[PDB]
Design a protein. Structure first.
Ligand SMILES: O=C1[C@@H]2CCC[C@H]([C@@H](CO)CN1Cc1ccccn1)N2S(=O)(=O)c1cc(Cl)cc(Cl)c1
Ligand code: NA
Ligand code: NA
Ligand code: NA
Length: 134
């Protein structure tokens, strides 16, 4: 499928370029992140709930979801989101804003038929962790 190949090529090229940039931390899983603003709060565990502000975009800059201008943050259980978020959240002190770069395998994978997120899409998120509930 043409889109699956295109998205894989673009994502791999992005991650390969981004890993060299100052402030980009590359984890063993392949998840990448960059600290935008450091917070001093607790880090959530895998069973915790979090309140967050966030924006998700594709490599070409297209925003596909955001809490911005909605008037409310979003709430998630740490383990009930995509793996890249589950992993990233557990490293984030409350109060922090990070940009995370999620390889498609830690997001929706290669059979993501279509919709907002098609196959082999590497996803980029700005995540402001507001609070953690144990
Ligand atoms: O795991 C998630 C991730 C990470 C947390 C923020 C959002 C939530 C918004 O509810 C969606 N999920 C879980 C989810 C639930 C149902 C279907 C697909 N993904 N997403 S997302 O990647 O921005 C996203 C947002 C939207 Cl509108 C559609 C999709 Cl398919 C994915
Ligand atoms: Na693409
Ligand atoms: Na707002
Ligand atoms: Na912050």
């Amino acid at each position: 499928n043409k889109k699956a190949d295109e998205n894989k090529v673009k994502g791999e090229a992005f991650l390969t370029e981004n890993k060299n940039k100052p402030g980009v931390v590359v984890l063993p899983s392949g998840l990448q992140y960059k600290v935008i603003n450091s917070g001093n709060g607790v880090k959530p565990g895998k069973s915790d709930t979090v309140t967050v502000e966030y924006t998700g975009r594709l490599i070409d800059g297209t925003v596909f979801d955001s809490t911005e201008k909605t008037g409310k943050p979003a709430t998630f259980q740490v383990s009930q989101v995509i793996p890249g978020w589950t992993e990233a959240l557990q490293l984030m002190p409350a109060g922090s804003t990070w940009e995370i770069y999620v390889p498609s395998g830690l997001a929706y994978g290669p059979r993501s038929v279509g919709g907002p997120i098609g196959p082999n899409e590497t996803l980029i998120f700005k995540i402001h962790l507001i609070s953690v509930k144990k």
